[PDB]
Amino acid sequence: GPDDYVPSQIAVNTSTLPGVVIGPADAHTYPRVIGELAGTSNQYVFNGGAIALMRGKFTPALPKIGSITYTFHQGNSRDSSDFDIYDIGVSGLGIIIGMAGYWPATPLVPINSSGIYIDPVGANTNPNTYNGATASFGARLFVAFVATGRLPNGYITIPTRQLGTILLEAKRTSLNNKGLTAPVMLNGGRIQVQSQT
């Protein structure tokens, strides 16, 4: 009865990307980060059962197409990270992903492998580490767009894509055994691009 946790997705929205202004000095330089979506948060990525020691593991779902170093502006990272660049099905574009715990002081964890703990980050260096026993597991999501080649002017349609999942791991075996996941989404929309001289 204690393991009545349910997942809730976390998403970012294409419509929050600023218009992409491409200056002459950049137009032919790739890969390059071309803007950030607005960061989002969800207190309740997993919630509902008896309080538990929990942690969340991110599994990417998109094809890797390269890597790049970057420092996100949002989330207050001091130092860069190396990110996998992921295919979204649009020529000239890719995305990079960072995630963090719900608590705002927790650090951005770059997505650059098949699996990482997004919170607590100490689980990446200690297999016995979980968050302290509590009702909920939350997260923050950060996505940026990457130009991997030349882009046309005007509107560019971006499909909705499942970026990956967060897996609920727990110290309690009966909860861990459920293997609950929550989707991590990019909601589609249209970006705009304009070169300038």
Quickly list DSSP for 84-136.
EEE--S-TTEEEEEEEE-SSTTSPPEE--SS-EEEESGGGGG-TT--PPSEEE
Please give the tally of structural domains in the chain: 1
Lookup: tokens for 89:
């099905």
**Beta carbons within 8 Å of 87's beta carbon, 6+ residues apart:** 62, 63, 64, 65, 94
Instruction: Give the whole-angstrom CA distance, residue 146 versus residue 72.
Output: 13
Instruction: Give the whole-angstrom CA distance, residue 195 versus residue 37.
Output: 20
Q: What is the torsional sign of CA 35, 37, 43, 46?
A: negative
Strands 154-158 and 40-52: unpaired
Q: Which domain holds residue 108?
A: 1-197
